[PDB]
Amino acid sequence: LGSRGRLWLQSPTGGPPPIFLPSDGQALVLGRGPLTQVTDRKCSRNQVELIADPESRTVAVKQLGVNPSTVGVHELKPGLSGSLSLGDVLYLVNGLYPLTLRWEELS
Amino acid sequence: YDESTDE
């Protein structure tokens, strides 16, 4: 359903604006900062690194932070990675601060 | 945003 488009992360209602991911393969680090608006000290400023794949509509997520991120139903550890498909949630830290993967068409 | 991370 739609060959060309951009992948982005949706925050809870009344949260930060859409976080669109580089469609060229470049990495995007997320964590405590103005992009996610998370101020929780348990969340790292470099919590996860994301690499988007628009063709498969998936996102690879590597944990860099000390405290556990959760990608779907898989809780990560530092150095480990999980995968997000459309509709899957990324919990930035300790089962909190969910970000849902969505797809915006160009047409 | 600029604090050290907890544990």
Curated annotation (Swiss-Prot), chain A:
Resulting phenotype, R41A: Abrogates phosphopeptide recognition
Compartment(s): Nucleus
Coiled coil ranges: none
Domain of life of the organism encoding this protein: Eukaryota
Domain FHA: 3-107
Effect of R45A: Abrogates phosphopeptide recognition
Protein family according to the UniProt entry: In the N-terminal section; belongs to the DNA 3' phosphatase family.
Free-text note on domains in this protein's UniProt record: The FHA domain binds threonine-phosphorylated peptides from XRCC1/4, and is responsible for the recruitment of PNKP to the sites of DNA repair. The affinity is ten times greater if peptides are also phosphorylated on the serine preceeding the phosphothreonine.
Function of the molecule: Plays a key role in the repair of DNA damage, functioning as part of both the non-homologous end-joining (NHEJ) and base excision repair (BER) pathways. Through its two catalytic activities, PNK ensures that DNA termini are compatible with extension and ligation by either removing 3'-phosphates from, or by phosphorylating 5'-hydroxyl groups on, the ribose sugar of the DNA backbone.
Assembly and oligomerization: Monomer. Interacts (via FHA domain) with XRCC4; mainly interacts with XRCC4 phosphorylated by CK2 but is also able to interact at much lower level with unphosphorylated PNKP.
Protein name: Bifunctional polynucleotide phosphatase/kinase
Organism: Mus musculus (Mouse)
Full protein segment contained here: 4 to 110 of 522
